[PDB]
Amino acid sequence: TAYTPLDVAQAYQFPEGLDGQGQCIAIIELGGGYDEASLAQYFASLGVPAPQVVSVSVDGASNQPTGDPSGPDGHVELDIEVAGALAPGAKFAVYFAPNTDAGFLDAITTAIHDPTLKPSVVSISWGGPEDSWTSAAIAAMNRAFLDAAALGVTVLAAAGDSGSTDGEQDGLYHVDFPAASPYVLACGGTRLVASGGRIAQETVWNDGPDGGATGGGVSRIFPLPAWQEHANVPPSANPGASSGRGVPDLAGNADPATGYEVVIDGEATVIGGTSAVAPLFAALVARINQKLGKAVGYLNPTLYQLPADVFHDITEGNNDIANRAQIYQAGPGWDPCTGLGSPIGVRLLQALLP
């Protein structure tokens, strides 16, 4: 199967009447590139206004599509098409930086502080397991997310496509950064079966070692935040059992099997992965900021205090691609596969009207 971004949104009941207008959404890109007119073509087919999109060169990098769908272009255009389709009245801001610790950082800090585009939400679909980041990068990164929160900016982050071990093949369980940061809205992945706006089934994304699986777990670097105390986060599965930030916060369709119908470098194709969820939730936020007349910024503490019925709870599956230990597994309420679960659009917004 497969769906357009609009089908997913309708599955998650995104609130109607909101196009994200007046909201600028930033997107972080670590290479590759998009073709403007081509994007403008994709939206038309979806029957949506083509959003205004701008490229910002960071550290000497820029919008440079290579033509390889499977290269960074697939990543760039999936980001813009998924969020562009759902918040088309919003201005889009794409920061390209070199694929590095530093370039990643300067991209995040430039968007966050950008005195002209002024993004209210930041969608990030890049990362690496948190134990592979320097201390310096980790510190500057959190300093930047802190800065986000303070400026009223909502930062979302894909939590990874390589199950509970995150492609760090050493036998232990690992979560990705920046999803692990508590200042970030960590986005996991699921397999959505849905029709007519009603969700039939929504399970943890896990197509095995080779099909990809949502990232998810418990950070042994960032401690359990106060707001996760009632979420029933388990200690890390790794030996030592320490206490830590449960990853993700929210989850949404990412299974390629039930993927997104896109157009990447001219070809029609169906792709999934968690790098689609963060731009997806990025559009929801923008619609909500639009409704309230104010940017919602940092949501994490709020989210964990809202009524559970604000979310579609995912209770079946596990994100273990490494073994048959079923680490970690989905369950009632918060779980280290899907978080609180998939947000219910109208419900999220209702609970945020003051």
Write out the residues near Ca ion by the rule CB under 5 A.
313-314, 335
Distances (CA, A) of 166 to 6, 130, 180, 217: 29, 10, 12, 10
- DSSP, res 73: I
Minimum distance, C-beta of residue 337 to Ca ion, in the bound complex (Å): 8
Minimum distance, C-beta of residue 332 to Ca ion, in the bound complex (Å): 6
Greatest alpha-carbon pair distance for the chain in Å reads: 53
Nearer to Ca ion, 72 or 341 (CB): 341
8 A C-beta contact, residue 69 and residue 265: yes
Closest listed residue to residue 350, CA positions, set 20, 87, 84, 13: 13
In angstroms, the CA 42 to CA 49 distance is 10
Nearer to Ca ion, 79 or 335 (CB): 335
Nearer to Ca ion, 53 or 213 (CB): 213
Letter string b/e over residues 134-169, b meaning 16 or more CB atoms within 10 A of that residue's CB: eeebbebbbebbebbbeeebbbbbbbbbbbbbbebe
Minimum distance, C-beta of residue 204 to Ca ion, in the bound complex (Å): 9
CA 218 to chain CA centroid, nearest Å: 17
- Quickly count: other Cβ atoms within 10 Å of residue 47's Cβ: 9
Minimum distance, C-beta of residue 319 to Ca ion, in the bound complex (Å): 12
- DSSP, res 329: B
Minimum distance, C-beta of residue 339 to Ca ion, in the bound complex (Å): 8
8 A C-beta contact, residue 27 and residue 96: no
Nearer to Ca ion, 81 or 313 (CB): 313
Nearer to Ca ion, 194 or 340 (CB): 340
8 A C-beta contact, residue 79 and residue 55: no
In angstroms, the CA 281 to CA 343 distance is 9
8 A C-beta contact, residue 264 and residue 78: yes
Nearest residue to Ca ion, scored by beta-carbon proximity: 335
Minimum distance, C-beta of residue 326 to Ca ion, in the bound complex (Å): 14
In angstroms, the CA 19 to CA 262 distance is 20
8 A C-beta contact, residue 251 and residue 190: yes
Nearer to Ca ion, 255 or 335 (CB): 335
DSSP, collapsed to helix, strand or coil, labels residue 192 as strand
Nearer to Ca ion, 7 or 335 (CB): 335
Minimum distance, C-beta of residue 254 to Ca ion, in the bound complex (Å): 16
Minimum distance, C-beta of residue 316 to Ca ion, in the bound complex (Å): 9
